[PDB]
Design a protein around this ligand. Structure first.
Ligand SMILES: COc1ccc(S(=O)(=O)N(CC(C)C)C[C@@H](O)[C@H](Cc2ccccc2)NC(=O)O[C@H]2CCC[C@H]3O[C@@H]4OCC[C@@H]4[C@@H]23)cc1
Ligand SMILES: [Cl-]
Ligand SMILES: [Cl-]
Ligand code: NA
Lengths: 99, 99
């Protein structure tokens, strides 16, 4: 698909057996999901943006489905105000910015 | 152009006759720039990102070139960690997300 940017580019994802809405976010290095349980090991991380830093849990090798496309990668879990699909997973679904 | 996302989507902008680096950010509603001088009056705005909210100065109808494309629109100025081009100006330069 081609998604215009008149509105927030929100898509449905499947993660951990759960459907969620998330933002396709080219300004995010990493993917950050609101609090949920994921299987496996994790380690703490701090990530920063406007308004400062939050502490998240870093889970590696997590499979997500993004708008129907499967990917695998690291997912950060923590008190983000919105679910964000960042570049680490956008690249895997072949997403590009075009103008 | 077609910009892949293996690296940050950084481009050159020109505002106030000055070149700056900025991130093309589909996760940002608005364009936010580090402290600089702009002409005219400003209005207050509060914006919320990953770490909480910050106060910014909103300047409307500012001339800004983004990756060689001319735009004229709202620029927020404040303590952002990086210059961000948000959807208000991404739409002016015709950007879409594609996968
Ligand atoms: C290491 O990996 C990551 C590190 C940081 C982030 S980030 O979420 O902080 N961020 C990085 C930017 C700031 C360099 C990604 C952004 O796209 C962020 C994504 C985002 C979206 C919503 C809530 C929080 C964060 N957008 C954002 O902060 O937007 C705010 C500034 C502009 C005006 C408003 O538009 C947005 O929509 C309305 C509110 C926000 C507000 C994500 C992954
Ligand atoms: Cl990854
Ligand atoms: Cl590619
Ligand atoms: Na893991």
């Amino acid at each position: 698909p081609q998604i215009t940017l008149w509105k927030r580019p929100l898509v449905t994802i499947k993660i951990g057996g759960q459907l969620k809405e998330a933002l396709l976010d080219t300004g995010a290095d990493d993917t950050v999901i609101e609090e949920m349980s994921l299987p496996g090991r994790w380690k703490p991380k701090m990530i920063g943006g406007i308004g400062g830093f939050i502490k998240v849990r870093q889970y590696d090798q997590i499979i997500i489905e993004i708008a129907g496309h499967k990917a695998i990668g690291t997912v950060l879990v923590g008190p983000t105000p919105v679910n964000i699909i960042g570049r680490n997973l956008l690249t895997q679904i072949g997403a590009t910015l075009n103008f």
